Design a protein around this motif. Structure first.
Motif, PDB file in Angstrom:
ATOM      1  N   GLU A   3      -6.451  11.378  -7.309  1.00  0.00           N
ATOM      2  CA  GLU A   3      -7.658  10.918  -6.644  1.00  0.00           C
ATOM      3  C   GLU A   3      -7.347   9.627  -5.895  1.00  0.00           C
ATOM      4  O   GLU A   3      -7.476   9.559  -4.659  1.00  0.00           O
ATOM      5  CB  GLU A   3      -8.827  10.670  -7.598  1.00  0.00           C
ATOM      6  CG  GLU A   3      -9.921  10.006  -6.767  1.00  0.00           C
ATOM      7  CD  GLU A   3     -11.171   9.750  -7.507  1.00  0.00           C
ATOM      8  OE1 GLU A   3     -11.441  10.594  -8.423  1.00  0.00           O
ATOM      9  OE2 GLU A   3     -11.863   8.727  -7.151  1.00  0.00           O
ATOM     10  N   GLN A   4      -6.961   8.632  -6.693  1.00  0.00           N
ATOM     11  CA  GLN A   4      -6.446   7.339  -6.297  1.00  0.00           C
ATOM     12  C   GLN A   4      -5.203   7.345  -5.351  1.00  0.00           C
ATOM     13  O   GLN A   4      -5.001   6.362  -4.616  1.00  0.00           O
ATOM     14  CB  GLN A   4      -6.131   6.530  -7.557  1.00  0.00           C
ATOM     15  CG  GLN A   4      -7.301   6.306  -8.536  1.00  0.00           C
ATOM     16  CD  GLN A   4      -7.540   7.419  -9.591  1.00  0.00           C
ATOM     17  OE1 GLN A   4      -8.554   7.401 -10.312  1.00  0.00           O
ATOM     18  NE2 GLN A   4      -6.600   8.355  -9.707  1.00  0.00           N
ATOM     19  N   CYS A  31      -5.307   5.608  -1.565  1.00  0.00           N
ATOM     20  CA  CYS A  31      -4.299   4.645  -1.127  1.00  0.00           C
ATOM     21  C   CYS A  31      -3.619   5.117   0.144  1.00  0.00           C
ATOM     22  O   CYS A  31      -3.040   4.369   0.883  1.00  0.00           O
ATOM     23  CB  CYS A  31      -3.283   4.443  -2.258  1.00  0.00           C
ATOM     24  SG  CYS A  31      -2.292   2.973  -2.178  1.00  0.00           S
ATOM     25  N   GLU A  32      -3.676   6.387   0.415  1.00  0.00           N
ATOM     26  CA  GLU A  32      -3.097   6.934   1.646  1.00  0.00           C
ATOM     27  C   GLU A  32      -3.864   6.473   2.895  1.00  0.00           C
ATOM     28  O   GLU A  32      -3.273   6.062   3.905  1.00  0.00           O
ATOM     29  CB  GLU A  32      -3.161   8.457   1.572  1.00  0.00           C
ATOM     30  CG  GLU A  32      -2.362   9.095   2.659  1.00  0.00           C
ATOM     31  CD  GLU A  32      -2.747  10.528   2.888  1.00  0.00           C
ATOM     32  OE1 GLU A  32      -2.274  11.018   3.956  1.00  0.00           O
ATOM     33  OE2 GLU A  32      -3.496  11.135   2.034  1.00  0.00           O
ATOM     34  N   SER A  33      -5.180   6.632   2.806  1.00  0.00           N
ATOM     35  CA  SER A  33      -6.153   6.003   3.693  1.00  0.00           C
ATOM     36  C   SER A  33      -5.884   4.486   3.831  1.00  0.00           C
ATOM     37  O   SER A  33      -5.454   4.002   4.888  1.00  0.00           O
ATOM     38  CB  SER A  33      -7.554   6.242   3.106  1.00  0.00           C
ATOM     39  OG  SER A  33      -7.743   7.625   2.756  1.00  0.00           O
ATOM     40  N   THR A  44       0.792  -1.209   0.000  1.00  0.00           N
ATOM     41  CA  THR A  44       0.000   0.000   0.000  1.00  0.00           C
ATOM     42  C   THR A  44       0.840   1.282   0.000  1.00  0.00           C
ATOM     43  O   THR A  44       0.415   2.292  -0.539  1.00  0.00           O
ATOM     44  CB  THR A  44      -1.127  -0.066   1.083  1.00  0.00           C
ATOM     45  OG1 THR A  44      -0.620  -0.239   2.399  1.00  0.00           O
ATOM     46  CG2 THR A  44      -1.878  -1.267   0.892  1.00  0.00           C
ATOM     47  N   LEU A  45       2.060   1.216   0.540  1.00  0.00           N
ATOM     48  CA  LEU A  45       3.004   2.299   0.545  1.00  0.00           C
ATOM     49  C   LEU A  45       3.651   2.368  -0.793  1.00  0.00           C
ATOM     50  O   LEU A  45       3.647   3.425  -1.437  1.00  0.00           O
ATOM     51  CB  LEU A  45       4.089   2.007   1.529  1.00  0.00           C
ATOM     52  CG  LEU A  45       5.050   3.191   1.624  1.00  0.00           C
ATOM     53  CD1 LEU A  45       4.215   4.482   1.638  1.00  0.00           C
ATOM     54  CD2 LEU A  45       5.918   3.096   2.858  1.00  0.00           C
ATOM     55  N   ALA A  64      -4.024  -0.063   7.091  1.00  0.00           N
ATOM     56  CA  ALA A  64      -3.252  -1.276   6.968  1.00  0.00           C
ATOM     57  C   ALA A  64      -2.065  -1.277   7.864  1.00  0.00           C
ATOM     58  O   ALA A  64      -1.522  -2.316   8.108  1.00  0.00           O
ATOM     59  CB  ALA A  64      -2.855  -1.475   5.585  1.00  0.00           C
ATOM     60  N   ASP A  65      -1.654  -0.113   8.336  1.00  0.00           N
ATOM     61  CA  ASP A  65      -0.813  -0.062   9.520  1.00  0.00           C
ATOM     62  C   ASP A  65      -1.640  -0.130  10.792  1.00  0.00           C
ATOM     63  O   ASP A  65      -1.206  -0.731  11.745  1.00  0.00           O
ATOM     64  CB  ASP A  65       0.081   1.175   9.601  1.00  0.00           C
ATOM     65  CG  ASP A  65       1.023   1.141  10.872  1.00  0.00           C
ATOM     66  OD1 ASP A  65       1.701   0.075  11.047  1.00  0.00           O
ATOM     67  OD2 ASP A  65       1.084   2.143  11.685  1.00  0.00           O
TER      68      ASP A  65
END
Lengths: 56, 56
Positions: free
Chosen positions: B33-34, B38-40, B19-20, B45-46
């Protein structure tokens, strides 16, 4: 039509999957606080995956 | 001390990562946008990964 765009449709695909498999394994484990966390996680990872599908 | 618990600390670890890496690749791509999506995704996910670290 960039190979960077396809690799990212790909990672986002696979994260949509892992999170389901993880979600599943965490039910098995009755690790249910964390199940709940992964359900969210899965559901935003399909939100992203499908964001990628469109734009790409 | 179950191998099911370690495999799940492991998948959750690797999803924290992907995800990072995905987030990074989506900045590169100015697919913003995307990126934001993915930051969320990374940040929950951490949250999960660390939920797993504790309980396990």
């Amino acid at each position: 039509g960039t190979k960077q765009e396809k690799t990212a449709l790909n990672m986002a695909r696979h994260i949509r999957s892992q999170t389901l498999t993880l979600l599943e394994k965490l039910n098995e484990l009755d690790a249910d606080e964390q199940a709940d966390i992964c359900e969210s996680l899965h559901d935003h990872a399909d939100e992203l995956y499908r964001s990628c599908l469109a734009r790409f």
